[PDB]
Design an enzyme around this catalytic site. Sequence first.
Site, PDB file in Angstrom:
ATOM      1  CD  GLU A  12      -3.118  -0.602   0.184  1.00 62.57           C
ATOM      2  OE1 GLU A  12      -4.021  -1.448   0.158  1.00 62.57           O
ATOM      3  OE2 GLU A  12      -3.157   0.413  -0.592  1.00 62.57           O
ATOM      4  CB  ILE A  69      -3.549  11.654   4.094  1.00 64.30           C
ATOM      5  CG1 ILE A  69      -4.076  12.435   2.904  1.00 64.30           C
ATOM      6  CG2 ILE A  69      -2.732  10.396   3.795  1.00 64.30           C
ATOM      7  CD1 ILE A  69      -2.972  13.216   2.205  1.00 64.30           C
ATOM      8  N   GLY A 128      -5.861   3.385   1.653  1.00 67.49           N
ATOM      9  CA  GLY A 128      -4.691   2.521   1.795  1.00 67.49           C
ATOM     10  C   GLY A 128      -3.770   2.844   2.904  1.00 67.49           C
ATOM     11  CB  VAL A 129      -1.247   5.555   3.612  1.00 74.20           C
ATOM     12  CG1 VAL A 129      -1.935   6.902   3.666  1.00 74.20           C
ATOM     13  CG2 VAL A 129      -0.024   5.485   4.485  1.00 74.20           C
TER      14      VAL A 129
HETATM   15  N1  LIG Z   1       4.036   8.963  -0.959  1.00 74.82           N
HETATM   16  C1  LIG Z   1       3.134   9.942  -1.202  1.00 74.82           C
HETATM   17  N2  LIG Z   1       3.434  11.165  -1.762  1.00 74.82           N
HETATM   18  C2  LIG Z   1       2.466  12.084  -2.012  1.00 74.82           C
HETATM   19  N3  LIG Z   1       1.127  12.007  -1.686  1.00 74.82           N
HETATM   20  C3  LIG Z   1       0.822  10.827  -1.075  1.00 74.82           C
HETATM   21  C4  LIG Z   1       1.728   9.759  -0.843  1.00 74.82           C
HETATM   22  N4  LIG Z   1       1.061   8.743  -0.166  1.00 74.82           N
HETATM   23  C5  LIG Z   1      -0.202   9.169  -0.099  1.00 74.82           C
HETATM   24  N5  LIG Z   1      -0.361  10.430  -0.619  1.00 74.82           N
HETATM   25  C6  LIG Z   1      -1.600  11.188  -0.657  1.00 74.82           C
HETATM   26  O1  LIG Z   1      -2.486  10.587   0.356  1.00 74.82           O
HETATM   27  C7  LIG Z   1      -3.745  10.341  -0.248  1.00 74.82           C
HETATM   28  C8  LIG Z   1      -4.425   9.166   0.451  1.00 74.82           C
HETATM   29  O2  LIG Z   1      -3.662   7.973   0.307  1.00 74.82           O
HETATM   30  P1  LIG Z   1      -4.408   6.609   0.640  1.00 74.82           P
HETATM   31  O3  LIG Z   1      -5.180   6.698   1.889  1.00 74.82           O
HETATM   32  O4  LIG Z   1      -3.371   5.537   0.481  1.00 74.82           O
HETATM   33  O5  LIG Z   1      -5.560   6.422  -0.484  1.00 74.82           O
HETATM   34  P2  LIG Z   1      -5.563   6.653  -2.084  1.00 74.82           P
HETATM   35  O6  LIG Z   1      -4.196   6.389  -2.543  1.00 74.82           O
HETATM   36  O7  LIG Z   1      -6.550   5.603  -2.571  1.00 74.82           O
HETATM   37  O8  LIG Z   1      -6.034   8.058  -2.303  1.00 74.82           O
HETATM   38  C9  LIG Z   1      -3.421  10.082  -1.751  1.00 74.82           C
HETATM   39  O9  LIG Z   1      -4.578  10.101  -2.606  1.00 74.82           O
HETATM   40  C10 LIG Z   1      -2.355  11.166  -1.984  1.00 74.82           C
HETATM   41  O10 LIG Z   1      -3.090  12.349  -2.227  1.00 74.82           O
HETATM   42 MG   LIG Z   2      -3.396   4.202  -1.756  1.00 76.04          MG
END
Ligand SMILES: Nc1ncnc2c1ncn2[C@@H]1O[C@H](COP(=O)(O)OP(=O)(O)O)[C@@H](O)[C@H]1O
Ligand SMILES: [Mg+2]
Lengths: 363, 363
Positions: free
Chosen positions: B39, B91, B116-117
């Site tokens: 993820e 996020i 995901g995160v």
């Molecule tokens: N490594 C990263 N660098 C930049 N933005 C990130 C990164 N990881 C996550 N994000 C931001 O966090 C948001 C949420 O991530 P997540 O919860 O994994 O769901 P999704 O990827 O489905 O949107 C992403 O849509 C992005 O805007």
């Molecule tokens: Mg994701």
Amino acid sequence: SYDSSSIKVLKGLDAVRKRPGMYIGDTDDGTGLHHMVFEVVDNAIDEALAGHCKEIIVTIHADNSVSVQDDGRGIPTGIHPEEGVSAAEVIMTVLHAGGKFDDNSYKVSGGLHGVGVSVVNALSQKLELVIQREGKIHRQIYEHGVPQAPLAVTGETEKTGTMVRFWPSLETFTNVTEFEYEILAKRLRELSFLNSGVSIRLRDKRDGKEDHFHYEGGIKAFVEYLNKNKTPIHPNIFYFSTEKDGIGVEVALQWNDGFQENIYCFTNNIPQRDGGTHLAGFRAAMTRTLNAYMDKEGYSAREGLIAVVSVKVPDPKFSSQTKDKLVSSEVKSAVEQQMNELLAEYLLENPTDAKIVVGKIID
Amino acid sequence: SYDSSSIKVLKGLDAVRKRPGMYIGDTDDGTGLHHMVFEVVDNAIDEALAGHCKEIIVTIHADNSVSVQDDGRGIPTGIHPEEGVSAAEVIMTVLHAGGKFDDNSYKVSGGLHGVGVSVVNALSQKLELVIQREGKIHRQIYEHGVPQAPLAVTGETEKTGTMVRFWPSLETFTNVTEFEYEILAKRLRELSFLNSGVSIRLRDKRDGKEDHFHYEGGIKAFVEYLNKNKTPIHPNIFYFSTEKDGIGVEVALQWNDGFQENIYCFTNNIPQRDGGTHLAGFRAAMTRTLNAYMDKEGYSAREGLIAVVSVKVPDPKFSSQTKDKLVSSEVKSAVEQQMNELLAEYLLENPTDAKIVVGKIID
Ligand SMILES: Nc1ncnc2c1ncn2[C@@H]1O[C@H](COP(=O)(O)OP(=O)(O)O)[C@@H](O)[C@H]1O
Ligand SMILES: [Mg+2]
Ligand SMILES: Nc1ncnc2c1ncn2[C@@H]1O[C@H](COP(=O)(O)OP(=O)(O)O)[C@@H](O)[C@H]1O
Ligand SMILES: [Mg+2]
């Protein structure tokens, strides 16, 4: 230009409508659309599993809405202490809210996640809710998941139960948008077999067609039904139902003269198209027991097999949200132990059957 | 006794920890545990897809935590207007919140649902977040998804990117609880092939093992790698990459002398184990084109085939949350049309290959 303003939060039910694939599946081929009915029906079936619902009526209305009426306990109507609105409204508008997060209301249930009927509500242009309990009729209407007013008492009754009627949103569902009698019937028939003594009715107000599913024989009758256009080779369907160490295991099976293998697995009445630990226990026991029998009778597998495996599990674990594969490792041993004991007995008690089946396997 | 007090609402990340099967999958066999890494990695890969990240470093630490460092834009750090805390914190703590609900930040992305995160964070005993952007280093620590303090600036930098390090919760994961180098390597290698010009490093601080995945040849090299222990029958791997009507289609394929069929399909770098509309377009084009060739050359299928189909889709639709099957119906025609045009050309331009392959199919 990628900054805080780029991050969007989807509140309440807006997420379901944005990402219906995660919650209802395919919105174009009809499987999602029918799953809307099945989420509602499975909630009534859970009242049946808890020993409170004896009749479920599913109606396809002439305006392409569907209603499901049960005679269970009724969705709770009282103000929810934390949320401050009726518990019914909490259920219909909040993801991950429900009565199946412990074992106090339902010992076992197909519902697990606290989302199903809230997804239905999210993806309906309109949803009508009528609840009977505590001597009162309670009514509420939603439009795209938004309630018109707080749940209100509108009359008195001596009955209990829940009626949901919903009109699917065409901003969500495309292509296959009219309900198919036979898709609904197939699952409702399966559920009559899996739940003896629940009466299930299906009525189509478009053409007057109706069915009443109330099969007598349970999953033994299910197997008979599954074999009816095949040619069973032996007359005694193997059947048992047990409950041990909190896990219910119900199995039936019969061989036909074909060469396909059809094993239908269920957990709390929810099918597992991709099997899992119940299927693994079943297969292990079948092998071991048939081999032990052949050895002890002095000779030297699943072709033609039709079988139903229905387990009842207090806190099942699946590989995903779809519940397609059961991963609860203790269920393997629960199926396996029961079916080694009872299938062995069956082969001893039904020697003509045993000889016929063993006959076939040899070949 | 079944009343409003029976209805429980799971707030924020409590739902993920209650029902990890719906969000991370199997928590006992290792696949969920490794999905936690994937993820995080797929979020870095999305920065690469957007043209901003050129290096990804994955480290397995000696304490069984894993970090993923990228050099992308950095998770947004500014206060989120609606939620009132940093966008990063939104996020990490809010389901269905992200930058992939429109096409303004990522034209295409593997991320879809906004979870995901936040799932990673929910299921980690601890998570460390370090973000570099706008000339500043920003730091935050979470314990079981709860932030210790608001995201804070702790230094200056001229670099950009995001580092997440997480320690998986053993209240969630059982049995397979230590990260496996080779599970992580297999996917990281695949991603180097699918994303040319991103450098991907994998380092194990337990034993000093390291890899640097930066394959030159893209999905053509992927096919060569997939055939390396088989016996390819013809030397010219078929390859194209196009973008039309907003859909990217990249295909490579080569036949070997075996009889298995291995077609690997991806959508925005996410694999589809159960195929879908890209696989359907590929299969239709293969059939039609090989038949047309055989007919026009005057003779009278997918055995031995290795192929990679990678599509780039602005708003993909899947059958479920797992993204195992692509259901976007317009992708079928996008694959199919490109591969009828280009595979036809390939057979004309590489007649020795064409004769060898057709040879095999006849047999
Ligand atoms: N490594 C990263 N660098 C930049 N933005 C990130 C990164 N990881 C996550 N994000 C931001 O966090 C948001 C949420 O991530 P997540 O919860 O994994 O769901 P999704 O990827 O489905 O949107 C992403 O849509 C992005 O805007
Ligand atoms: Mg994701
Ligand atoms: N027909 C019904 N009768 C009684 N209670 C119901 C019925 N339908 C739903 N409920 C209640 O609503 C709750 C939420 O339902 P739902 O959102 O479908 O998720 P889940 O079934 O996974 O809990 C249930 O857990 C149950 O407490
Ligand atoms: Mg439910």
